[model samples]
Target: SMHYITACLKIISDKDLNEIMKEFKKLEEETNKEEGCITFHAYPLEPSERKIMLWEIWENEEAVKIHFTKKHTIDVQKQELTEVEWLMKSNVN
Candidate 1:
């Protein structure tokens, strides 16, 4: 069973965008090395360059939970970006 997670972020400014992306690159590297990570990606939207979206898939809920405790996760959480919207889902079939 796989769990899917998506998050939308509204960056505060171009400066913040650059900073956040640097962090995101670090997160991407760290997350991909995790035990149960299936996929993780961050995409910058076209129409709204200040908007970003993250898509991730994990082996299970526990894996997803463990991800939250990782250093990269902690670091990202501490950052004062802008507003964020999260979407989580489970693989049905």
Candidate 2:
């Protein structure tokens, strides 16, 4: 089986960390129920960076696709949160 990895970079401004956390909590629960989620987590990179990382792992390419098409996926994409500082995403087998 191939592994799928995704990294999300975010800059949490407006001091809306609490609100973002709440939204993420809900989304995390939804992600947990997804059929192909191998690993999923959101975290702050380091004490100095103060940057956020949304790390995810899926079973395969299909799983990754399913993640993007799921119901919660739409909600997540539509979420209104602090603008990100830098966003870069890619996948590798």
Candidate 3:
């Protein structure tokens, strides 16, 4: 199984969506350059638009484990502007 993840972050009222998107875009850009990071994308939710969804694929579980320790990921974690909920994502192919 490949390592993949899905997370939904609901923006807190005090934060502007555009700024959050900008932050995500920066994170996406940097993460893609890391070894073993396959794909990382952040996009707005359909109707409500307050929820931001993250879709990421890593080379393996080890890669993901390393990713969590990175400063970029850590920085995102420090944000108080959203409530992040991780989903059970599996890739068998």
Candidate 4:
């Protein structure tokens, strides 16, 4: 079954936001080139400059696992942020 992950994070500052977005762009590009990536996007919440969301879809659980080991993932995990939430799910049918 397909795997999905949704993440929301609060930006720590304008500086962090700018830096985070630069990294996110690189991450998005590299993730799209992965073997089983279905979709991966990162964007700010509408009307909210301090909030960002990331949505990801993968072909299977193994694909998602592989994603965790990527350089981008490792780098992103090192960022400092607040109000972070992550949800993982699979298709119901």
Candidate 5:
């Protein structure tokens, strides 16, 4: 229940990484600017290069909660990511 959440989300998307990741790349930049957000990454899954993944680390639970409320976040949310199968759910030591 710590603030650190450097977990990778396996997101299923209908679009290719080339086009979609540009948005995420920008998203990550803005996200990192948040006081609560420590870092974030956007990349496509290897082999398949079909599914996308997001590596994120936030300051705390409160920060995590408020992140989606951000304008940039809302814009990204507009995209249709088909699914979000959970991946690593751990914290840094």
Candidate 6:
């Protein structure tokens, strides 16, 4: 079976990429603790200003679904995203 993948990302607040990297570290920790997560990583765009990408891979659609239902994800939507601006997202296999 082919599992689905998603990248939930937002634009940085004209802030330093280095500083944003720190926050991403914490996000990475949260992702790593999830049960259904296969791999998760954060990357900064080159020649970039305020763009951070969060790439996540799950075992399957069920795993991806479970990820969103977790406490961490819920808290992120409630808290973190509020501080930043989002552009768009895409789900790719």
What shift in Å separates residue 31 of candidate 3 from its native position after superposition?
0.8
Model 6 CA lDDT for position 23 = 66
Question: Which one wins on lDDT?
Answer: 3
lDDT of 6 by residue, 1-93 (tens): 435444445553565667666667776788778877778787776635456666666666787678778776676556443233443333455
lDDT of 1: 0.79
Cα RMSD to the true fold for all candidates: 2.2, 3.4, 1.9, 2.5, 2.6, 4.0
Better model by TM-score: candidate 1 vs candidate 5: 1
Measured with C-alpha atoms, the lDDT of residue 62 in candidate 3 is: 84
Off by over 4 Å in 1: 12-14, 47-49
Clashing residue pairs for model 5: 3-60
Off by over 4 Å in 2: 12-15, 46-50, 82-93
Deviation of model 6 at 12, angstroms: 5.6
Q: Give one digit per residue, the lDDT tens place, for model 4 in 1-93.
A: 668878887777556566768777888899999999999998877535588898988888898889879987777767654456556576633
lDDT computed for candidate 3: 0.81
Model 2 lowest lDDT segment of ten: 80-89
Q: Looking at model 5, report the run of 10 residues with the lowest lDDT sum.
A: 1-10
Residues 6-84, model 5: lDDT tens digits: 3344546766667777887888899889888877787767736456677777667678778989999889888765356
Of candidates 6 and 1, the better by lDDT:
1
The TM-scores, one per candidate, come to 0.80, 0.69, 0.83, 0.75, 0.76, 0.62
Candidate 4 TM-score, true structure as reference:
0.75
Q: Name the regions of candidate 6 deviating beyond 4 angstroms.
A: 2-8, 12-15, 80-93
Q: Write the per-residue lDDT of candidate 1 for residues 33-65, one digit (tens) a residue.
A: 999999999867774568888898889889888
* Stretches of candidate 5 exceeding 4 Å from the true structure: 6-12, 47-49, 91-93
The count of backbone overlaps in candidate 4 is 0
lDDT of 3 at 33: 85
Q: Per-residue CA lDDT of candidate 3, range 1-93, in tens?
A: 578888888787567778888888888888898898889898888736688898989888888888879899789778866787656677656
* Number of backbone-clashing residue pairs for each candidate, in the order shown: 0, 0, 0, 0, 1, 0
